[model samples]
Target: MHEYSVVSSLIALCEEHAKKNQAHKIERVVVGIGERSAMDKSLFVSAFETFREESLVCKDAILDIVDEKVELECKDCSHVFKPNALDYGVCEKCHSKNVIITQGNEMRLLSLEMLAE
Candidate 1:
């Protein structure tokens, strides 16, 4: 599954960062997952466990995923709206079909909590 590769890449990044910073261990990894990214959180978590087994830095690391909702801005009325779900086709306030998606299309690593000891 792609989740394995995704988690593997994340682990590799965390390992590299930990080595550069001389961190003893990784405590937590906070990731922002967009609605349109199409990544299943459960699958990613499961893959994390497998990927961490071979890495010392991420052996006991916890993956915290923050779900990011889709945002749409109406061009007609210049109204900004955050959709409650993924399939946001129109703007709520202006009811305009001319809406542009502002976010929810990327997976980003927000921060990492490292331990010194």
Candidate 2:
């Protein structure tokens, strides 16, 4: 799975950060995976669990994945809400087709709990 590569990069990033901060280990790793990111959380988690074994910095770290919701906004009424589905672009409040997506298209590291030397 592509999540293997993704986990490699994520571990690299964590190692880089830990090195810069003089951290001996990572306690917790929090990531935000948006609904639109199309990343499989299960695969990502399993990949991370497998890959982290090679990294001392993240070997014992806890992985926390935050599933972000897809939010849409209606231009007609300025209403914002979560969509029933990804393609459900219509606004819930006003049922306006003239709507735009306001959020839920991001996949990034949010925060880390680390142990420094």
lDDT of 1: 0.79
Tens-digit lDDT string for candidate 1 (11-75): 89898888888897898988888866657788888888888888878898888988887667888
Give all candidates' CA lDDT scores: 0.79, 0.83
| Model 2, C-alpha of 39: deviation from truth (Å) | 0.7
Error of 2 at 61 (Å): 0.4
* TM values, all candidates: 0.67, 0.68
lDDT of 2 by residue, 1-117 (tens): 267888899999999999888988998999988766657888888998999999888999999988887777888696777877545778876666778766756457889999988
Deviation in Å, model 2, residue 74 alpha carbon: 16
List the candidate 2 regions with Cα displacement exceeding 4 Å: 69-106
